[PDB]
Amino acid sequence: SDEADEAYSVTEQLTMTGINRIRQKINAHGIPVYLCEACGNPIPEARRKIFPGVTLCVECQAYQERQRKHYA
Amino acid sequence: NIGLMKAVDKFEYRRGYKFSTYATWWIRQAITRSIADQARTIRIPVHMIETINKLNRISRQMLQEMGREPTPEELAERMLMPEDKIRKVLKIAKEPISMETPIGDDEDSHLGDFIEDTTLELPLDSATTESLRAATHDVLAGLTAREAKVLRMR
Amino acid sequence: AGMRGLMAKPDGSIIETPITANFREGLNVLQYFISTHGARKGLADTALK
Amino acid sequence: DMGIQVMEEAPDADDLMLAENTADEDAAEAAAQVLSSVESEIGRTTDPVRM
Amino acid sequence: VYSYTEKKRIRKDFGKRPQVLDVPYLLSIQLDSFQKFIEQDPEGQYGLEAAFRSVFPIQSYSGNSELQYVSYRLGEPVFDVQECQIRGVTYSAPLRVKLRLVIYEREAPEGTVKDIKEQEVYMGEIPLMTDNGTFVINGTERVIVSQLHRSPGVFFDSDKGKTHSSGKVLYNARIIPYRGSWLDFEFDPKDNLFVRIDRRRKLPATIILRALNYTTEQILDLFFEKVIFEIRDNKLQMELVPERLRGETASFDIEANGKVYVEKGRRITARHIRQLEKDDVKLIEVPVEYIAGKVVAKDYIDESTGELICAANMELSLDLLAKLSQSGHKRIETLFTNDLDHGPYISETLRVDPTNDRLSALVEIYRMMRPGEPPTREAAESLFENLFFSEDRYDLSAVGRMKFNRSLLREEIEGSGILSKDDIIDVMKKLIDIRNGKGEVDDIDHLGNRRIRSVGEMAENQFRVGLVRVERAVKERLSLGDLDTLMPQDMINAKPISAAVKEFFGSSQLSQFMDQNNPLSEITHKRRISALGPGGLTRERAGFEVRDVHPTHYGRVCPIETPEGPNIGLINSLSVYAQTNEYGFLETPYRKVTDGVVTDEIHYLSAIEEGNYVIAQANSNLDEEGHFVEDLVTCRSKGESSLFSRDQVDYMDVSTQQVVSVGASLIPFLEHDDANRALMGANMQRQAVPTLRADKPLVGTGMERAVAVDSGVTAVAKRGGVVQYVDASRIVIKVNEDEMYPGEAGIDIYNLTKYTRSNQNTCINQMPCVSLGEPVERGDVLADGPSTDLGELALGQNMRVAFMPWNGYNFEDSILVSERVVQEDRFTTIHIQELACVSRDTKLGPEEITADIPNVGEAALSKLDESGIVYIGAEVTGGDILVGKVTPKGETQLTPEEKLLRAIFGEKASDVKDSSLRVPNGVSGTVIDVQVFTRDGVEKDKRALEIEEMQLKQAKKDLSEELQILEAGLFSRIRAVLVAGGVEAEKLDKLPRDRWLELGLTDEEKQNQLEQLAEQYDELKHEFEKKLEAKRRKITQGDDLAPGVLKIVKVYLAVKRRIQPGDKMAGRHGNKGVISKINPIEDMPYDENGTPVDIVLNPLGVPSRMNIGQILETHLGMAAKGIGDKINAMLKQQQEVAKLREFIQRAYDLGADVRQKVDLSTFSDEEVMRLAENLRKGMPIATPVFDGAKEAEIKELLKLGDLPTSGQIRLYDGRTGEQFERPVTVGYMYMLKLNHLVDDKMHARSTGSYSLVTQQPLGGKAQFGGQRFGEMEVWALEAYGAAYTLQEMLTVKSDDVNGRTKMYKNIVDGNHQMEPGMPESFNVLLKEIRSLGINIELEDE
Amino acid sequence: DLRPLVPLDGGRFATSDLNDLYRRVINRNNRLKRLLDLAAPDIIVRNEKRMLQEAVDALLDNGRRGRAITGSNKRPLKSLADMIKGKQGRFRQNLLGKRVDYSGRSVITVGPYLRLHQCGLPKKMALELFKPFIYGKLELRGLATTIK
Amino acid sequence: KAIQLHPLVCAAYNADFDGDQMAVHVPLTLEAQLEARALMMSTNNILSPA
Ligand SMILES: [Mg+2]
């Protein structure tokens, strides 16, 4: 084939694997938790409605994402 | 080192010299003789190296006197050479190019990989030679024994 | 014909501003430019390959 | 010449000549030996003008 | 409101958005840089003056033998541009400097100067720039590309992932000065902060702070906030700001107000702090359990014993609480640490920090800089004062200081030159604030770190290097510095500095041959941003990090122009509207938006400044006031883009083009193409060889006219007026009286540049586009060049394409051109060559250029004249004799029976050897021009005398036609004087014009005026007499040839390559193709009217490659020729101008809003007829790049014709004469012709020359040798069973120097064997492996 | 002839590098012999033997010694352990990838009128690849008595 | 001057016709001709080796 078509297939692979990585991160399935899995605080049922199966609060979730920003 | 050894071997205090500045001359002379004799790849003689450095000194002097640069016809009158020795001198006094020079204008090549062979006989020529041998042999067979023998021998 | 997805910037992280247009329609400046990231990553890999 | 084959500047390196290695047994034991000996005893001179 | 020179034909132009900032002079980078380099500049800034000032004044070895500077001048060249391309000199300019050697006296601190010897001394020749930013180094017009390197300053790189393998990242920070020692910072995995001077060993990063006269207390109070602890009558009370304790576990209940505001154990939520702020707490008492791990900052020692209680930066415990308790310590200052935000970094690095005070740190730094050097007080103090803090060894150039201050978000643009306390302190605070969470790294691509050198700056740097290596010799010669004997030139040697500058301009990875094959290609080569070369990063070290596009390339580098292949992204193309900043960065335009108005004031923004605004986007509707028609409009803020309010945007983009370059903006319908296919499109449009009768773009993008004019090919009128004399060679404008200078008015003259070789061996031609007696506005194109039509760039020609497979003569990506395309000569392009035939000076004798040659009868020498150079006009073919030449060759040394032949026939084999220049096999052209050169020691032959005669008559005629005009202007001035004081109008012209000088006149100032003007006239006479003399002396005098040559003879062939299977044609959208069958007219398809579609591409190439652009272009071109044919009928049934007016005026208004309205009720009848005649070929439609023709507009412009709105036609096959089912596409696609022609790639070698060290095939002409039968091919031939084929593939055919001739004799004998033997390469391998101490042998059994 | 000194056009010669290295080694050997005849002090002969050691060690490999001895260029001059090694040594570069007489090339094209066992081919590449075959056949059919 | 290759074999060479350049060699001997016919002819390698 051509030097463009190979690049098309590689770009499709790259965007596919990215999109699947970020669909895998979202939960949308699990059992209701009723309270944080880190601090014990309650998860308000609105946030649980937005994501079925939120193992964390918003506070602990933000904290964990924020430590993970430095990738450790 | 060699020059300093010769200086030691040919020193005397009976002329009141200072040995440091005495041996400085011998050192510089021996190193000059060496840098002339065994520096160029193809070895040029001593007087030739003196002529070459004369040409370089005068080339620098003219290349800021005349402004642009001097021609051989002008060097043959600042220098007083026969106008043809200058051509031969400035032909000779240049180094050789390193045959592993990278002619990087390719995949990856070298100047050495581009110098063809000149003395090889073409396969066309070799075939023609063999054919001509055969032809002249049959021709000479197309003579008598005495004829062919004399015409081979002469 | 349909829209064309979400250009993935060469870091690996997928940009969140999708291309709500397609090739039968135009592509305004931002959208074509965002396409440029993934296009040039494809080139810079099928040049090393 | 030891096991390490870099010496680096940049850390990596991908599919471009990817996952390269040569075992080169019986060179590592002598190279590491030369290191541990050059460090422990004294610092050796190099070249001959400096000699 | 169009000019009379644009009404020739007026492009129908779609494209809504009213532009505001017309395209810049496309070459401003080149011209502006080299103008700033070489210009007398009374200020130390950019220019040679910067170079001289820095090196100078200079001084001898402390004894006052000084050598200062005065000024410099650029003397005129000896050879102008065209003679310097004809001959082969470097179009240089002599350099001249007014140095001054001044010497103070021995025992003279500052006493009066004793000697000052002044003189002007030569050095180098800085090659001057042509009009078009193209230097002329050795006959070949060369172009220096702008480099792209790191702006010296601060960076915060990341190095994320790989190191340490635990997923943890680091944050190194580098402070790179323009000159001086680096300074790196970095974290370990263990999180201690580590400093390092130039790439030497690591150190505890606090060591530099202690060495900056900082002790531990102020270190901790630099890098931390404070949390106090108190004991107010009970158990360790606490101060508590609400922000401190966000999201953490408590080792206590949150008690206050006699109340539980918070219960222990929970992580302190936000609403926690909200309620506490509704509380206003200043205090909560907690147990010792939470102070048992704090970090006490300030030093505590007893008030009664003065004893060391708790040291700085130790973690207290309860016993330590009591220890500092009972002797009166009420305040305990503790670091406010945390794992998320305010992490322990400086404290823990203090843990690692062995040294304590300034002395120990200085000692450690001193030993780290130079090993084994004993530590000493003043030693270390001076070392740390000269690492980063003294003018000598460390200088952030002002570029650097700007980056440094700006990158720390510091207000001032300019400041100090070197580091200082708060500089290093803010670098460390910024590194920490990066790693805490609040900040971002600056990846390498961001154009706030890519400062663009260009021709002026790099030439300045190389001349800088020249000056430093010369001032070595200057201070050397001033070692023995004599007072009144050595003038200020014996010291200085030109050939060093001149050699350096020549090395740059001719030996560099930047000074490279220009692409002269296409005006688009010239003007997209001069405009280029390269990352490679000296000072920049090469391929392997770098590296992907910079092969990529970063979100700040928008308007500063084309995203879709970069040569795919080995180095993508390293060869970015400078964008359309973009410039170079003052300091050197790239900067694009924007429109300043006021409160809600889009004010017109364009406003150049750099790359480091773009994020801190909120930029609108040019696809925004604005309603005749600069008001955005909505309340929200799409914008980009910091990379990210997102809908923003109406009153938030601070800038709107200038015009829709600025994202793209000039290469990719001449592609119609770029908005409908994948970025890769558009990249290949632009990258092939830069290559289209200029065809013979260049047509025009039937669909273009408006920019084509600017790229035609702003290149150098066309000839823009310097002043406007009437065209007095159009000729095939020149044009003679008579400049209007509006623009005609009062002194010696005269006229302009434009000697066109006819057929001359280009760097790519194509035909750079110029034809005249204006017919006699015509007006010409200022700034008009008078002479088309290569690929320019009436001032519009036509690279290829437009031809009637149709998408349908058709028997698979276009299978993969092929094209199927019908012989109606090859008959007309509409790709018949022209190629011109420069065949040389030198005549060297061998030791055996000199080669002559004699015509009398041995063993070539008068059958081939019929063409040569009496001197061995072919006639100007021969129709030589492959093999003739162009320059009959013979070299001496002694030593006949014949053989056996050959000698018998000599005896039988008496044929005397002369000592003469034929080595004439015979035409390279395959070409059949017309020798258009022969030039001869001669070292000035050889008697010029007969033909060289013809050529001097001819050129001298030419120059005489030209210079006479010049001097006529000049002395006519002087006559005009004298006449304008006579009207003052003695005006006698119509009895002053009847007599001869020469009889005006000898006319009397009143003895006023006016008579002395006639005196002066008579002197001017006679001086003009004498002066151009001598100027003709100087032309004749440039011709007649010899040449300065290479050493050892007598006379070189160049013969220019002019082949005319037509078109044929192999010649890659390709549209503008990156649809390649190798034309593969040149079909009869009959066999092609043909729509129902008779017209046979020319090219027949492959439909299977569009859906697989998202470049539907070409299909929209085909429909639009079809409609455009529809308008063209309607005009053709209306003109050929010739109706009346009213019909054409109504119809063309319909074609230009056409529906949707535009920026085009023409109003043809202003043209005269004898213009609209001209306009119609220039439109009958097809109405040229435009489409600005991202403002294209929306499809409904094309459907309507097809209805304006009579084509089918669907865009498709029923095509009747041309062989079977029956309708192709399912209507196909047709239309006119604009197709280039890339110069990968077939008769340059074809090659075949049966037995050529051979190499010298390794006897392998090495032939030259078209690599006149075998194909590289490399390694993987050998694996192929091993994979088969093929063993004999392989053997004769690399033993007989290739190397074994007996096997090959035995093979050839056997082949001619019709006996296909091969007596192989053993290769020659392995034999060389034995001799080499054996030259070492290695006995290699061959066992024999 | 494996390290030639070819006469290039103009008097300029383009020699290989082994001539340079051997010239250095022969110089140093002769100089050491000359020192021995005089019997210089031991610092002299020691430095000379070291120089000869470095010269020979640069002749063989020009590496493993720490710093190559580059020629009049700034480019390190190749040596006998380096004309065998590398992707340009005789092994990989002239014992596997060798040019080949009787070859050619061109732009490929489409050509659907072929059975799959016959590639098209130009008249001119054919008449340049098969000159020996042509010559044999033409001296066979007596259309040219001699090969010329 | 174009080597008019067959169409089907292009999948095997992995060669579109965008200007790609194939090289022709020639088998000199007689064993090499029988091998360029009985082992490397086009119509004896239609099954992919893998
Ligand atoms: Mg291809």
Ligand SMILES: [Zn+2]
């Ligand atoms: Zn929670």
